[PDB]
Amino acid sequence: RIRHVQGDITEFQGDAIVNAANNYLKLGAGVAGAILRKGGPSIQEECDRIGKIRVGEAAVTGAGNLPVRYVIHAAVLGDEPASLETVRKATKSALEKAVELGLKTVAFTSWGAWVGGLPAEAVHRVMGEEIKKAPDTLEVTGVHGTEKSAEAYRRASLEH
Template identity: 50%
Template sequence: MSKDWRAKIELRQGDLIDADVDAIVNAANNDLMLGGGVAGAIRVKGGPSIQQECNEIGPIALGEAAITGAGRLPARHVIHAASMRLGESTSEANLRAATRNSLRRADENSLKSIAFPAIGTGIAGFPIERCAQVMLDEVRAHLGGPTTLEHVDFVLFDHRSLEVFDRVLAGMKDLR
């Protein structure tokens, strides 16, 4: 694998719901209920159509991802990455699968750009360092194969999370 996968990744601090990309990724529960955290912000700014679409789709299996429209958000779609059950924690296996399946939904819909939060690190309590390792590993593997994605953003809520993702990305080796 060449090093060009790194050129497709951008890490930045900001508000995910303001990302102007083909799809933002919601750190979702498997019932696809837009409650608090990232999901709550998506519900409030995006409007009721997103939850209505989720109600028609959900529930989905843990580790799966579903795609909806984005309502009034700048993005065209929301990909709901189910890394946890409502009220429970995110596991590494579910985070890995939810990230992988989010990337697959992007390809299935011929999307060119996607923006992720640090899935599972808020209300679901997953450690930020391990989150960065798992998510960046999945993105690196995905970008190494055939994909429609040209740009993968990680929009991180605070400076500490950005520093962790920066450090993890800098330490990653290319796959052979």
């Protein structure tokens, strides 16, 4: 239910990508920058017309010129700081949205740009638990910058 690959999430060709976000849905930091660049202005514009949400919630937009149908914005910080709990909620909420849209293929990054203050392995652990709990109609892809990293993530998923 989760496969880890080297690639560019702005090149994922499935139903949706998950984009880590502040709760004000003001995009730009991290992978969002590339998403705005290649996806175009309509992604922030739709966010502007959703308004702000709560930390731990997710919100859905179209994907502009990207080869996915939807972007799922997962609010990990803002009005309160990122923690293992906000990470858990934002993941569960992102996946809940995907299920609501009746989607099958969804892609996350490592959320690294958003969890600098947290212990990496515990963050990976919590998102993994939420992903595991998600229904089997979903196929989740983790996308990483380097093969070395993705092979590390796959190797780590062999710890069981």
